[PDB]
Short mmCIF file of C-alpha atoms in Angstrom, two decimals:
data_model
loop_
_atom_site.label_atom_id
_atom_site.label_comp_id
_atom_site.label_asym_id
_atom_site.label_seq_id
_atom_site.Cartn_x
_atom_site.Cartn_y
_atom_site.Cartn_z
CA UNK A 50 -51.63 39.59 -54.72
CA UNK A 51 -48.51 37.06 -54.86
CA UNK A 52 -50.79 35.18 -52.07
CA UNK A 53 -53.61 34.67 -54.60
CA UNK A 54 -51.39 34.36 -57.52
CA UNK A 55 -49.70 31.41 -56.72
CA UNK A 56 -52.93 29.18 -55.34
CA UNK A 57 -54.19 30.25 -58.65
CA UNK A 58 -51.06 28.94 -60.46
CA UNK A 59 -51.18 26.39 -58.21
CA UNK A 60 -54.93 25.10 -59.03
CA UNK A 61 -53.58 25.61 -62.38
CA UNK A 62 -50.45 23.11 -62.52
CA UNK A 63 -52.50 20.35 -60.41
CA UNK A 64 -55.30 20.36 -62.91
CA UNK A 65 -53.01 19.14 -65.05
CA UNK A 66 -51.24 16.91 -62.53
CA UNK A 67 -54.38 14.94 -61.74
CA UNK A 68 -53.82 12.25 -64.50
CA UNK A 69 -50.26 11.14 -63.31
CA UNK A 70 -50.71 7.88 -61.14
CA UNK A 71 -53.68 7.37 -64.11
CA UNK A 72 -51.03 7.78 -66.89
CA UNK A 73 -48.70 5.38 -65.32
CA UNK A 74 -50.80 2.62 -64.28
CA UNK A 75 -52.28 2.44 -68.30
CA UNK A 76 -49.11 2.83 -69.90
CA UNK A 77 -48.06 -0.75 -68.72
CA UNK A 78 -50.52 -2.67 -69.52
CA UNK A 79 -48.93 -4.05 -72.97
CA UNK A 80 -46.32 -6.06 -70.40
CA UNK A 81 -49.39 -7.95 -69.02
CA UNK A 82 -50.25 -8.82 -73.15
CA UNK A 83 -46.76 -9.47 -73.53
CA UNK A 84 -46.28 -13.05 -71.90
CA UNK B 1 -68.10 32.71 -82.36
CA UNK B 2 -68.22 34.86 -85.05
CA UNK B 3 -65.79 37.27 -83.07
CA UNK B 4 -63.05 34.91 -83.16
CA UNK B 5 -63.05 34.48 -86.75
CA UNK B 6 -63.42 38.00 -87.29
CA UNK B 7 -60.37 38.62 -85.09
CA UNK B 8 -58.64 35.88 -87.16
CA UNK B 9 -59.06 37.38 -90.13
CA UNK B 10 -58.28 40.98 -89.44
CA UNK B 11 -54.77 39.55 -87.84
CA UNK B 12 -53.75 37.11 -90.62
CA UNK B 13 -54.54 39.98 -93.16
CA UNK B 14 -52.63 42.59 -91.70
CA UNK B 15 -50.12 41.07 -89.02
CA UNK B 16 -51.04 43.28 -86.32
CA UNK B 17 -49.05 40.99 -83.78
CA UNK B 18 -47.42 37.46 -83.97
CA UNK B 19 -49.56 35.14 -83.26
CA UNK B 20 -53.37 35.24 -81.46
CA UNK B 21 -55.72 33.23 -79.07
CA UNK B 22 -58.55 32.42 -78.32
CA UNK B 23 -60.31 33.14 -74.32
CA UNK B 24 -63.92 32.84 -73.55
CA UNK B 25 -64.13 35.18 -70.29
CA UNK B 26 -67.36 34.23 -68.56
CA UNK B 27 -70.12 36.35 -66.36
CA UNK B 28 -68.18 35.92 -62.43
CA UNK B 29 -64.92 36.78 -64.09
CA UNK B 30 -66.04 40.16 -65.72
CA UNK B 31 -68.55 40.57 -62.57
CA UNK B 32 -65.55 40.60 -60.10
CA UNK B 33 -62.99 42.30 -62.48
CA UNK B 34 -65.73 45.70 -61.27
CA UNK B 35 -67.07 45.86 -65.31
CA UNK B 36 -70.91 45.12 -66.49
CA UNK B 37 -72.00 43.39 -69.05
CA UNK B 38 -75.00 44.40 -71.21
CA UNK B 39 -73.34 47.47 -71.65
CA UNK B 40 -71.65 49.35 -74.81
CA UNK B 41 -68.81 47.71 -75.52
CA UNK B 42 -65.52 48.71 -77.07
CA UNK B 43 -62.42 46.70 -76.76
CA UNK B 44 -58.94 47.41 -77.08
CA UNK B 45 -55.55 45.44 -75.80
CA UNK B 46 -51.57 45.56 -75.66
CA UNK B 47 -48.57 43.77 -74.57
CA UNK B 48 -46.37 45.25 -71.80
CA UNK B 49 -42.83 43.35 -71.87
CA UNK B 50 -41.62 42.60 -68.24
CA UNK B 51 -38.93 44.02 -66.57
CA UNK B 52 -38.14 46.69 -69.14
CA UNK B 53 -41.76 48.84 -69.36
CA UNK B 54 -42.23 48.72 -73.18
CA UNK B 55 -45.95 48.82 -74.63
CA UNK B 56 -46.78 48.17 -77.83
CA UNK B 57 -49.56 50.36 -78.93
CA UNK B 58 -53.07 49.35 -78.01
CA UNK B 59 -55.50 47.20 -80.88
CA UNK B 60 -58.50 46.86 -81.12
CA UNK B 61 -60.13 43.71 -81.24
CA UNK B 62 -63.51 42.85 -82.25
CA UNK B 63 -65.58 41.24 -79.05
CA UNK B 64 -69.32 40.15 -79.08
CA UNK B 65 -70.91 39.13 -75.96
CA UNK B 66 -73.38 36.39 -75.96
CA UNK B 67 -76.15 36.46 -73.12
CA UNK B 68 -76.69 32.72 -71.98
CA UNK B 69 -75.08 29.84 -71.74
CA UNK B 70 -71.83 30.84 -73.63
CA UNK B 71 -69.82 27.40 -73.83
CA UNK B 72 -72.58 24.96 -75.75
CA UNK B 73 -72.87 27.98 -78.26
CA UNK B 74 -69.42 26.83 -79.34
CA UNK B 75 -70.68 23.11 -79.70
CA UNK B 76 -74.07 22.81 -80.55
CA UNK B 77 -76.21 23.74 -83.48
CA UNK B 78 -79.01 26.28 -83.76
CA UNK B 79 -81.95 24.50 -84.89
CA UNK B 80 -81.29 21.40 -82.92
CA UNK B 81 -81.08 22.87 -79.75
CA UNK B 82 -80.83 25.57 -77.33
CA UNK B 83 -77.52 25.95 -75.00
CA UNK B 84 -77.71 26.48 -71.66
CA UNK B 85 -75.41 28.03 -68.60
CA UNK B 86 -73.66 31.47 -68.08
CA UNK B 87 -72.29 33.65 -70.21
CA UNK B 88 -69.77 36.04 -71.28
CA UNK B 89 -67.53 38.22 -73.81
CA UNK B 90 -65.60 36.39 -76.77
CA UNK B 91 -62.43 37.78 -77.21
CA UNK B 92 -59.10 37.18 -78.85
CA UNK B 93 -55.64 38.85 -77.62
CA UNK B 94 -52.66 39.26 -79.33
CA UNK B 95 -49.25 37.37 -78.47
CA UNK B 96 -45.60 38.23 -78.88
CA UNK B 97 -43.79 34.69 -79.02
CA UNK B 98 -42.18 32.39 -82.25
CA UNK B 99 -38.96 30.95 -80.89
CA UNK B 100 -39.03 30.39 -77.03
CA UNK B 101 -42.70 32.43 -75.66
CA UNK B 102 -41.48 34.49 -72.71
CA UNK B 103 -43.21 33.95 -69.23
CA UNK B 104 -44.38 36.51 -66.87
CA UNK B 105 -44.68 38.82 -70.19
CA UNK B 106 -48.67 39.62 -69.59
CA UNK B 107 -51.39 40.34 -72.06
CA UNK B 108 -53.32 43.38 -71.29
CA UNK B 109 -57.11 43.59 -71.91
CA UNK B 110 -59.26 46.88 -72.01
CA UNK B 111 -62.82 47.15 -71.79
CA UNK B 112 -64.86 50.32 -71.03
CA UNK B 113 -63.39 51.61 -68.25
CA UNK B 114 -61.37 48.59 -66.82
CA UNK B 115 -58.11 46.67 -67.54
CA UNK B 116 -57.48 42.93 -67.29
CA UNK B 117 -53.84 41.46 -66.84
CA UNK B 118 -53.04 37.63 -68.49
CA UNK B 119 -49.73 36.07 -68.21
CA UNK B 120 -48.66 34.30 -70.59
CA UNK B 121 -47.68 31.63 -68.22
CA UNK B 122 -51.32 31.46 -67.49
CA UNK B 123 -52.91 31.77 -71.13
CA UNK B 124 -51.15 29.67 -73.08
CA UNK B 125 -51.72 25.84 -72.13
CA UNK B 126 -49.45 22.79 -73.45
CA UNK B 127 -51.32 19.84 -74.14
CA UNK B 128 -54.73 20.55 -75.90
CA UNK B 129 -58.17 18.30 -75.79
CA UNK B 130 -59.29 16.90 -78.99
CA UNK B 131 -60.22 13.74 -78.26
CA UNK B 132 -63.09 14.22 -76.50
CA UNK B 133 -64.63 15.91 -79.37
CA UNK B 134 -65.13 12.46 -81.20
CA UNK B 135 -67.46 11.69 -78.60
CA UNK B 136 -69.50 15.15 -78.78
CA UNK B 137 -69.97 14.86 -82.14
CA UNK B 138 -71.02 11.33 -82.58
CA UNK B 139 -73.90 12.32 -80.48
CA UNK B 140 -74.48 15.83 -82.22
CA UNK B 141 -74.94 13.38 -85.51
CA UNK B 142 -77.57 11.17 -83.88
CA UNK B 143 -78.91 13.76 -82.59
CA UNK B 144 -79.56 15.36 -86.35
CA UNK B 145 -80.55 11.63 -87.03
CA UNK B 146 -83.58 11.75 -84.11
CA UNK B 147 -85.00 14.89 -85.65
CA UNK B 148 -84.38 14.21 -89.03
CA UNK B 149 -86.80 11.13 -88.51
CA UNK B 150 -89.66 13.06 -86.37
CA UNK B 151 -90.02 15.95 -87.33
CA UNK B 152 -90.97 15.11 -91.17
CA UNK B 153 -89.44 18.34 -93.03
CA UNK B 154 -87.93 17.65 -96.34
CA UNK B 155 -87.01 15.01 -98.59
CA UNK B 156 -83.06 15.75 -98.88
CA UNK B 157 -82.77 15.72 -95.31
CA UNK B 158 -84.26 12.81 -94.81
CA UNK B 159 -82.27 10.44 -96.75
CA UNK B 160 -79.47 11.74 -94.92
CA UNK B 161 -81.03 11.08 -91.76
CA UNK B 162 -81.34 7.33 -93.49
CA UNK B 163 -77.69 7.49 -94.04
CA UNK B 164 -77.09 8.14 -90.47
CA UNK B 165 -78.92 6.13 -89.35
CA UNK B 166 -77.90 3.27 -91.17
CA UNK B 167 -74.16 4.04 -90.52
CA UNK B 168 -74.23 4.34 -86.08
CA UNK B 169 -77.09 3.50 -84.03
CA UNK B 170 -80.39 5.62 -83.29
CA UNK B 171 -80.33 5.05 -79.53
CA UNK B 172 -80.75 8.64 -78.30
CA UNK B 173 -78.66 11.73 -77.45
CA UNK B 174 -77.91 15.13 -75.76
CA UNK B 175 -74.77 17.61 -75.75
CA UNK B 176 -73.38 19.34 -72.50
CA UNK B 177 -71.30 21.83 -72.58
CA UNK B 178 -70.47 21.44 -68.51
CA UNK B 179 -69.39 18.01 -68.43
CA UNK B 180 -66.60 18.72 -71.01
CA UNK B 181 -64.85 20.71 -68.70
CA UNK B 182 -65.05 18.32 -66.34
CA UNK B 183 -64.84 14.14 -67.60
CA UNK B 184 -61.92 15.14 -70.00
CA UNK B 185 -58.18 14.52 -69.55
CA UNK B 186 -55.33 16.21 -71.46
CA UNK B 187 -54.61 15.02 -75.09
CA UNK B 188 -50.95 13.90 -75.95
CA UNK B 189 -49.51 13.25 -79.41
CA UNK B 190 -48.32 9.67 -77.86
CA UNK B 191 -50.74 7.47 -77.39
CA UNK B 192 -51.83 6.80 -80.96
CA UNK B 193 -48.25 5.28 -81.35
CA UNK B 194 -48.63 3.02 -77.94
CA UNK B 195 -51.59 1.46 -79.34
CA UNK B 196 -49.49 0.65 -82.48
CA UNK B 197 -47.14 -0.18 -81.45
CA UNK B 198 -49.09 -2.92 -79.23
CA UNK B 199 -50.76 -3.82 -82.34
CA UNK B 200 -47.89 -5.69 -83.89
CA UNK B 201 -46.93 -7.35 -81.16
CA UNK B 202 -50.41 -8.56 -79.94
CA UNK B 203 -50.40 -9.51 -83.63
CA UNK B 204 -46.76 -11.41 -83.35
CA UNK B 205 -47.60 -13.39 -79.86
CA UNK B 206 -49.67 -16.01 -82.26
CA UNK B 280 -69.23 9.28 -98.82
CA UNK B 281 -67.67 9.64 -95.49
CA UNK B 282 -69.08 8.65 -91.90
CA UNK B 283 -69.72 12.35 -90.64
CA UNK B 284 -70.12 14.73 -94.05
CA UNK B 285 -73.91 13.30 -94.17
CA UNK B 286 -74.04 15.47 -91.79
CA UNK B 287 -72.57 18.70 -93.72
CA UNK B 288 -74.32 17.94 -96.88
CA UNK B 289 -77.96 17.66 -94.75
CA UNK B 290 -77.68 20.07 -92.34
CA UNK B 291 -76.86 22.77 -95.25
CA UNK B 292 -80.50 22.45 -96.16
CA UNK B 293 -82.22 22.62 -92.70
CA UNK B 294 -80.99 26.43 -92.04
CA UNK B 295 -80.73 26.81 -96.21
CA UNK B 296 -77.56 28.96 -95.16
CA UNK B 297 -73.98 27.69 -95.07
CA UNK B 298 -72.86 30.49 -92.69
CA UNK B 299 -69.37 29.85 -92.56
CA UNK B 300 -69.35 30.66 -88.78
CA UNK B 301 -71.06 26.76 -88.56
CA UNK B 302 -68.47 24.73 -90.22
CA UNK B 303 -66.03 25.23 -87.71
CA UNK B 304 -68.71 23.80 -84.68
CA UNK B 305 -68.23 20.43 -86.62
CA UNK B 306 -64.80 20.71 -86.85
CA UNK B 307 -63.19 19.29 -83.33
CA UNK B 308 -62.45 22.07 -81.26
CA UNK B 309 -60.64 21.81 -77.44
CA UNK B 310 -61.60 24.07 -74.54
CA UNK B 311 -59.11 24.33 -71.49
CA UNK B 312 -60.50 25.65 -67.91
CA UNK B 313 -57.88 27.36 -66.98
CA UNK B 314 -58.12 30.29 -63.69
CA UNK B 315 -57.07 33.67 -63.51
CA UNK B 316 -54.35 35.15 -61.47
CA UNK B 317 -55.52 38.88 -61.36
CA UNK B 318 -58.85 38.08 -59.18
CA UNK B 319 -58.79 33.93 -58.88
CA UNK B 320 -61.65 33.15 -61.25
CA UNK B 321 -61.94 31.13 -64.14
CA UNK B 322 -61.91 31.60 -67.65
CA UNK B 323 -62.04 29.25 -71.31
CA UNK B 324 -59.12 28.99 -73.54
CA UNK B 325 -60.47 27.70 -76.94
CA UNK B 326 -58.92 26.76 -79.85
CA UNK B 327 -60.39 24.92 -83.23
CA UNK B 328 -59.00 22.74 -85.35
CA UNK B 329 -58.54 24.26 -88.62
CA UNK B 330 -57.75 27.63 -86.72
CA UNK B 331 -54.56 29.67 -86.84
CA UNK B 332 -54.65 30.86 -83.54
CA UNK B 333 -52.39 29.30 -80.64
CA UNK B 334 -53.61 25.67 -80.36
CA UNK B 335 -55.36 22.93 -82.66
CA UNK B 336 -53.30 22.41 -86.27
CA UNK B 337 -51.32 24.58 -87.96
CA UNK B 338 -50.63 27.07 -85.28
CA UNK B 339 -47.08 27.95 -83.68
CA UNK B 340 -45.93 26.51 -80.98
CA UNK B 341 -43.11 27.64 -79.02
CA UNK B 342 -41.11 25.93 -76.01
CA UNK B 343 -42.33 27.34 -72.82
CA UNK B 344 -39.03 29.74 -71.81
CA UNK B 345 -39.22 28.36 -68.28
CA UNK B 346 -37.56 25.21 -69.45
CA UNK B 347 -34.07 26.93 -69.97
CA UNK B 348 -34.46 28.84 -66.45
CA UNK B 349 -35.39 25.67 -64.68
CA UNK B 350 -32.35 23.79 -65.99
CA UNK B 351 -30.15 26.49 -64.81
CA UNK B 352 -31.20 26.94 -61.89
CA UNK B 353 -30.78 23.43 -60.84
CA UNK B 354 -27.64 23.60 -62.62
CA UNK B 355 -25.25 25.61 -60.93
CA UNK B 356 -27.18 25.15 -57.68
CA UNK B 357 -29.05 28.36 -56.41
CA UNK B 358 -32.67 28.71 -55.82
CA UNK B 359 -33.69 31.90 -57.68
CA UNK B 360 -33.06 32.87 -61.36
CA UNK B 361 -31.87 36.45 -60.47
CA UNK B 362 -29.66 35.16 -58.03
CA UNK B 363 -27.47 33.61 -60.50
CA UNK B 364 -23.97 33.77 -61.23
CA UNK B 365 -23.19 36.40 -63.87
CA UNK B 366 -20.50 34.30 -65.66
CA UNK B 367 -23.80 31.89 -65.64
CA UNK B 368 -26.33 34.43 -66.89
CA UNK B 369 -23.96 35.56 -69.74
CA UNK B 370 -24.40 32.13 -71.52
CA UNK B 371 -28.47 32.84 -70.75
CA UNK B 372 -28.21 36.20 -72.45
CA UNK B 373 -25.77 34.78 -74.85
CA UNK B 374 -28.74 32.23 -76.57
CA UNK B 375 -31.83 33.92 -76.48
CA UNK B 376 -32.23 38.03 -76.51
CA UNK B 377 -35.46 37.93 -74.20
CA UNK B 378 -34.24 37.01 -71.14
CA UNK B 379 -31.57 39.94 -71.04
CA UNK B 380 -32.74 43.13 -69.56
CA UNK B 381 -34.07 40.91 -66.64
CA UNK B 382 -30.82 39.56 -66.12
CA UNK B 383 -28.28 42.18 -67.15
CA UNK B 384 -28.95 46.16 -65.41
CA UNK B 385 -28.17 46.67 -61.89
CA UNK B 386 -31.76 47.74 -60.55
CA UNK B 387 -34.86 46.96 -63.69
CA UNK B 388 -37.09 49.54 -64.20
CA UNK B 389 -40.10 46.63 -62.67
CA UNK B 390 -40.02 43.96 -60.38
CA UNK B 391 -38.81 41.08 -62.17
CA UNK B 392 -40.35 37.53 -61.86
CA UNK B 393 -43.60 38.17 -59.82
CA UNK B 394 -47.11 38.02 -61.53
CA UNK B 395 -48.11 41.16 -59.72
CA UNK B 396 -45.76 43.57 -62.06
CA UNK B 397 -48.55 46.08 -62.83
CA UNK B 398 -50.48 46.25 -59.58
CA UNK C 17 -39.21 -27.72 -85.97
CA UNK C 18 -37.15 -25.03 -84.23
CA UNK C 19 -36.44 -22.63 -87.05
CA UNK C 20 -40.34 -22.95 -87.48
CA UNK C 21 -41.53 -20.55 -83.99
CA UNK C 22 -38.84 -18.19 -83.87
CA UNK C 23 -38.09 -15.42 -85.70
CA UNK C 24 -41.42 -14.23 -84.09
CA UNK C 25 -40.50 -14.48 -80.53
CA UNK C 26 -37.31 -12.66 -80.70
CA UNK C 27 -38.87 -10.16 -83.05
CA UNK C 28 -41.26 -9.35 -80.03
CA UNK C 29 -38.47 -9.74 -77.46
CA UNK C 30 -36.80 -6.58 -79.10
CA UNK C 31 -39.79 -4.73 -80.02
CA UNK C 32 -41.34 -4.62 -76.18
CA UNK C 33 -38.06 -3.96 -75.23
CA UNK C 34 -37.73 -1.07 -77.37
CA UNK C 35 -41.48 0.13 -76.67
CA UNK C 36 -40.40 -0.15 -72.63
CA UNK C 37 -37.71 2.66 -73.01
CA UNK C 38 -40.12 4.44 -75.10
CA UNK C 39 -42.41 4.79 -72.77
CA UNK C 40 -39.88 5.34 -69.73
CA UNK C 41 -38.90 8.45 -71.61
CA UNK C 42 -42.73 9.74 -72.08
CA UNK C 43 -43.08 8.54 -68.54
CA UNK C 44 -39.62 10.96 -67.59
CA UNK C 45 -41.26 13.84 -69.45
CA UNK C 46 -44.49 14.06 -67.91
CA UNK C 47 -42.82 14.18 -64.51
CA UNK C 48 -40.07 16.84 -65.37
CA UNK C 49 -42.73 19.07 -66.78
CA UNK C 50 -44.92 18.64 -63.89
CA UNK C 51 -42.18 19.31 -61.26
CA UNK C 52 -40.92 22.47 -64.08
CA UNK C 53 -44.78 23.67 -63.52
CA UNK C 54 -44.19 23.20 -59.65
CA UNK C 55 -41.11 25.15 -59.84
CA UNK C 56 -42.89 28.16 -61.67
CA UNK C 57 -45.34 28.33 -58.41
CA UNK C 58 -42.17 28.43 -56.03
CA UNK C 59 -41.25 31.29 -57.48
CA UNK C 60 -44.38 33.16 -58.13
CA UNK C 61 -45.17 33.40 -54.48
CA UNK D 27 -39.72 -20.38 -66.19
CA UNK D 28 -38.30 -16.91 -64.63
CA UNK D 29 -40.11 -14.52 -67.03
CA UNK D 30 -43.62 -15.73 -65.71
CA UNK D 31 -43.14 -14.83 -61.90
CA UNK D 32 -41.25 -11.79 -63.01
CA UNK D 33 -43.40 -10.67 -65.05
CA UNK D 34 -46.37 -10.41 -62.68
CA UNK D 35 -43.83 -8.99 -60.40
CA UNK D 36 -43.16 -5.63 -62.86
CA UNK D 37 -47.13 -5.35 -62.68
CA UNK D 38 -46.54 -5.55 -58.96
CA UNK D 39 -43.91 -2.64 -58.70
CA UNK D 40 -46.03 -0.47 -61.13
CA UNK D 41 -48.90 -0.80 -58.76
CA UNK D 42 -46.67 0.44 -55.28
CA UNK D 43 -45.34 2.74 -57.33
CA UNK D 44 -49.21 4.30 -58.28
CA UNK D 45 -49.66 4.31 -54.45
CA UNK D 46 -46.04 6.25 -53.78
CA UNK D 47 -47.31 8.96 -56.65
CA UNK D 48 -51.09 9.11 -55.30
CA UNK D 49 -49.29 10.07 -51.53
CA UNK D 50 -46.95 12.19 -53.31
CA UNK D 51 -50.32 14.11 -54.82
CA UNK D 52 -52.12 13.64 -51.37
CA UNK D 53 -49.26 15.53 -50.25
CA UNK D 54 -49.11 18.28 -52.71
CA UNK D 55 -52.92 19.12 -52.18
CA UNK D 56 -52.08 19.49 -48.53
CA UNK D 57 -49.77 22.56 -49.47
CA UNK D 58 -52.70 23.82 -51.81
CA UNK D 59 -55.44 23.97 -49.10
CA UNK D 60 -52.74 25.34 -46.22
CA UNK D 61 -52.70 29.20 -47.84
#
């Protein structure tokens, strides 16, 4: 049970996870703009 | 649908719990969990506390179980086309949460014979999805425009379909429930300020477009039916799995809803954030392993987290999602 | 002349600047939750 | 005429840094697919 719980949880938190490198690549592109 | 705005109702009316949400449990789920659709139903649920073996008594809950495809029900309209996929029960639980929602606290769901287990920590998910519902709907609209303009019904309609047309282009269009699940990415309340905030300095370095719609559509079916008004309304739908069998299962929430999700719900800080800080704090690896002297501050702020903390032995295993099995 | 392209350039000077520790503490909160998330797993099994 | 070189050089540093976070994912999945 605790076996199958936590790849589930773990599926779970990566889902989320997969936007990360995403997220911080976009979020500096004003500094390109900005010169 | 019209289950979760029953179950809405009936909770805002007479506070049977805290708060509420919103789970579309699909065939595979309910097909593993050893129950049948297509049968009688009649559910119930409670909430069982962890580490202390407290139920409140069971409530029942209005469920309706839809046939086929179950997630384009939620976004598409009846007469303009059909949805498609698999399908399963609508259901809303009830919560116990308001200043810091508890983890490992499950949710228990009855059905006919069986009983489903969902922890909160799996239920409930932070960040929502709305912004890809700007994208469904523009289409949904052209969509109403292309049949508006073929099929040649009425008069009132048709100048609405003008409208539309006149407002976005005719090009073409289709809804898919599937690929919402998968194209999306998680919605923060950010962004709207990074693009302002660029705004000024990219600036420095030198009726309405979607009630056409409403006001048509209300003459196609002739019927308002309330239970529509909310599919044009933006709504978010999280996949999110299951950690009872390892399946999946929808958490929905609309916009205008008060369930947990969209606008003008509750929202509450998940409880793990406290434990995680102390336990990197004072340096151990485990949250029961803790320093009393520690755990008395814990106890000290927020009344949950005592009887896991506090008593020699608990009655339950503390801090494992398999409690009840 | 040089009290005529100023104000401007120092105004956005200070506002990126500002925007830049903005966003490194949106940047500091997606990665504490996601490790906080992490943590939750190390525990459950 | 600093803030020209260094600027491209922040884009630079954002872009290893993607790569460090996309290995650190990499990484992560390994763990998921082991149990």
């Amino acid at each position: 049970a605790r076996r199958r719980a936590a790849a589930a949880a773990l599926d779970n938190a990566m889902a989320a996870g997969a936007r990360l490198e995403a997220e911080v690549d976009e979020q500096l592109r004003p500094l390109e703009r900005q010169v | 649908m019209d289950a979760h705005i029953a179950n809405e109702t009936k909770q805002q009316m007479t506070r049977f719990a805290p708060a509420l949400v919103h789970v579309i449990v699909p065939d595979p789920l309910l097909a593993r969990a050893g129950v049948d659709p297509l049968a009688p139903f009649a559910a119930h649920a409670q909430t069982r506390y962890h580490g202390s073996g407290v139920c409140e008594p069971w409530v029942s809950v209005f469920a309706g179980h839809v046939q086929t495809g179950a997630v384009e029900s939620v976004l598409t309209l009846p007469p303009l086309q059909r949805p498609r996929g698999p399908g399963g029960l609508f259901v809303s639980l009830p919560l116990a949460l308001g200043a810091h929602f508890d983890g490992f606290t499950t949710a228990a769901l009855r059905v006919g014979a069986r009983e489903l287990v969902f922890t909160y920590d799996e239920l409930l998910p932070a960040r929502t999805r709305y912004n890809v519902d700007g994208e469904r709907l523009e289409r949904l609209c052209r969509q109403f425009a292309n049949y508006a303009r073929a099929r040649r019904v009425a008069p009132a309609v048709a100048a609405a379909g003008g409208h539309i047309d006149a407002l976005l282009p005719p090009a073409a269009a289709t809804i898919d429930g599937e690929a919402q699940l998968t194209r999306g990415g998680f919605d923060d309340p950010a962004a709207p300020h990074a693009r302002d905030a660029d705004r000024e300095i990219l600036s420095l370095v030198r009726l309405t477009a979607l009630d056409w719609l409403d006001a048509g559509y209300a003459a196609l079916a002739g019927g308002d039916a309330p239970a529509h008004v909310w599919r044009r309304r933006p709504v978010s739908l999280v996949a999110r799995r299951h950690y009872q069998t390892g399946e999946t299962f929808v958490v929905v929430a609309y916009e205008h809803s008060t369930a947990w999700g969209g606008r003008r719900g509750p929202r509450g800080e998940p409880l793990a954030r406290v434990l995680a800080e102390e336990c990197e704090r004072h340096g151990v690896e485990h949250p029961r392993a803790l320093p009393a002297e520690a755990r008395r501050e814990l106890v000290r702020r927020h009344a949950e987290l005592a009887v896991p903390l506090g008593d020699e032995e608990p009655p339950l295993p503390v801090f494992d999602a398999t409690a009840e099995l | 002349t040089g009290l005529g392209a100023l104000a401007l350039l120092i105004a956005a000077c200070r506002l990126i600047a500002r925007r830049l520790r903005e966003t490194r503490t949106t940047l500091k909160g997606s990665a504490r939750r996601f490790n906080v998330d992490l943590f939750q797993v190390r525990l459950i099994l």
